[PDB]
Design a protein around this ligand. Sequence first.
Ligand SMILES: [Mg+2]
Ligand SMILES: [Mg+2]
Length: 339
Amino acid sequence: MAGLYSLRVSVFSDQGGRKYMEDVTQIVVEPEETAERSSVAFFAVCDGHGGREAAQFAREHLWGFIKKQKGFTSSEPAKVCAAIRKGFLACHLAMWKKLAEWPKTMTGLPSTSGTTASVVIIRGMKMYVAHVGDSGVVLGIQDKDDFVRAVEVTQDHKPELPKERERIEGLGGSVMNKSGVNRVVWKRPALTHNGPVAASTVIDQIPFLAVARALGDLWSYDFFSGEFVVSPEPDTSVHTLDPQKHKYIILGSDGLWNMIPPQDAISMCQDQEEKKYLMGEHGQSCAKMLVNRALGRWRQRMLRADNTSAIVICISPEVDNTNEDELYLNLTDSPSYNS
Ligand SMILES: [Mg+2]
Ligand SMILES: [Mg+2]
């Protein structure tokens, strides 16, 4: 069952109209002694907020925390998903220890930085997907066909999602519509012995987050229960890749998905793939095309563009290799990339 297929990967991110770039992306391909030096491929999009520090920390450390966990190289998927979940948690817990080193807010309080994190890990014919937040992951599947259908395989962790609101209200928080957007409302401040700032002023400085799960956001720690109101535990899923039917995996931040719906995005990739081999080295990758398309829609709607990021993975049943901004991967050939 050790199947042969190829991937072609592109990635692009743009700051949009924001003053800082807090989106990050990551791609790591490395041989696994487990799969007899067949390579595992890790892809991630992290949409940071409250400062770039958390997203940058996940960029540098999330994959290492994941692949260290017991059961990660197990052949049983339930154990792989369990290891991936533990790696998210370990990365979150490592940020807590880093918090003193991250820059203070403009009022002198500890950093409020946090980040969504969406991860795709391909090993063999299996695709593991883990996420916290709203940087969605979309598959394209061809059922032959000249139409590729989008499938959304992650659900955004919005505060008003019922499972999330239940968890938040159970810790003593609330979910409130603030200016048309539902937000987590937490009023329990992080109090110290040596800190100067007034407690009532700490309370007013607590963020109102638009996601209910993230890595970081350590202000959400609940001293009473020991839980974090903004949860670092990801949803996990496993899918069997069928190179005859699966054609695309898109990971993206909400800068992309707020402008470009899943089917629009998958149908655009299907159109760009034709063009990409007519412009050759100098056409836009699918990822670059998606980001620029979203930026065009932000502008056309007269809105400041968010940070916008995408990773597009094209799946091919062939294993025979011209776009300079695309990485070709055959995982049974032990490629190494950024590793
Ligand atoms: Mg952001
Ligand atoms: Mg965003």
